[PDB]
């Protein structure tokens with residue numbers, strides 16, 4: 280009927296005095312037209328899920344804010360989410376940004392200062408919501424520069440919110456690149 | 470040091486008296502030059518291997534791959550030619566093509582077996598923290614600009630990408646992990662050589 284759905288995993292907070300780790304490197308980065316880098320409805324953080332062959336399972340993470348659900352284009356490619364007792368339908372989304380909006384337009388405004396040390400609210404599969412601080416590094420692109428979080432989490436975390444000391448959501452996890460060592464590193468995609 | 474590594478998990482074999490299932494959608498699809506479909510020293514023993522990175526939750530299955538005639542094959546989005554430790558030693562990526570969405574390590578591509586056109590196939594899905602299964606289905610196709618391309622309607626977790634579909638004679642007909650979802654949400658995977 281509608282394979283996918285969301286289930287929530289807490290409200291968005293800043294863990295004061297949480298744990299800190301991360302390389303914070305500055306590195307220069309291309310950007311494909313597909314969004315690749317190179318060289319109901321209650322405010323809260325949800326998990327995107329799918330009823331599959333091995334039954335139910337987490338394909339990514341999205342955040343719910345003022346009536347509107349926000350995740351990453353590659354996670355849903357605007358499929359329909361069966362949120363609560365009713366359906367939930369795409370409104371807008373751009374593949375190069377790698378982002379999607381259900382029910383309304385993009386509601387998330389705050390931005391990385393180039394000063395603040397940020398906080399990833401990771402929500403990995405079969406695991407509980409975790410907060411974690413880091414000095415983000417940077418993605419030196421030809422047009423603009425993007426804040427970058429050196430944090431290796433597993434598949435299905437993609438679309439976890441990155442945060443400001445305020446508690447504000449300043450972009451999403453799980454679009455990035457890997458270094459030579461294999462270490463993962465994500466863009467603060469906004 | 471070299472986060473990413475692989476671990477063998479068993480033999481590629483066909484398995485008769487397998488559980489049989491799935492649809493066969495003949496569908497109308499096309500794919501950009503980035504690879505995305507869109508709708509309208511280290512040891513190299515044969516068999517199927519799981520792929521692992523070593524991140525902030527320990528060690529997790531990024532994907533899956535097949536290992537044959539001295540060379541490792543998996544999806545390109547899984548590694549993007551990231552180096553892979555195996556046993557005592559490394560495997561450097563040899564060849565690649567993001568459009569196909571493939572990569573080969575320590576030698577060129579080796580798997581030459583290709584879609585029957587008409588005959589049931591088995592997915593040897595090796596999902597994360599779970600038990601490699603064999604499951605059969607009759608493929609649909611994706612009809613395209615550049616001709617028909619076989620595909621299977623088999624919905625499996627993130628991290629099974631790279632895992633081999635194969636023929637009645639165990640010949641790896643192509644990997645799992647690139648595909649698109651029907652309106653419904655259901656995943657459907659192109660079997661990619």
Ligand SMILES: *[B]1([C]([C][C][C][N]C([N])=[N])[N]C(=O)[C]([C]C2=[C][C]=C([C][N])[C]=[C]2)[N]C(=O)C2=[C][C]=[C][C]=[C]2)O[C][C]([O])[C]O1
Nearest residue numbers: 313314315338339353433434435437453455456457463549
């Ligand atoms: B995600 C996953 C979350 C990050 C965890 N993965 C790690 N550490 N290996 N993100 C990715 O897999 C992204 C996916 C992506 C798809 C499409 C586009 C638009 N062209 C952008 C990003 N891939 C990468 O970041 C990546 C980088 C370098 C090498 C390989 C892959 O994604 C899908 C599901 O949610 C599973 O988790």
Ligand SMILES: *[B]1([C]([C][C][C][N]C([N])=[N])[N]C(=O)[C]([C]C2=[C][C]=C([C][N])[C]=[C]2)[N]C(=O)C2=[C][C]=[C][C]=[C]2)O[C][C]([O])[C]O1
Nearest residue numbers: 353356503504505546625626627628630646648649650656
């Ligand atoms: B796979 C993963 C297999 C899990 C299938 N998901 C569900 N929900 N049943 N496949 C994908 O995530 C691929 C990733 C991909 C990245 C980059 C490119 C660049 N051309 C192509 C493909 N994406 C899709 O198949 C897809 C389909 C429909 C909607 C969104 C995404 O397992 C581990 C990792 O995720 C890598 O692949």
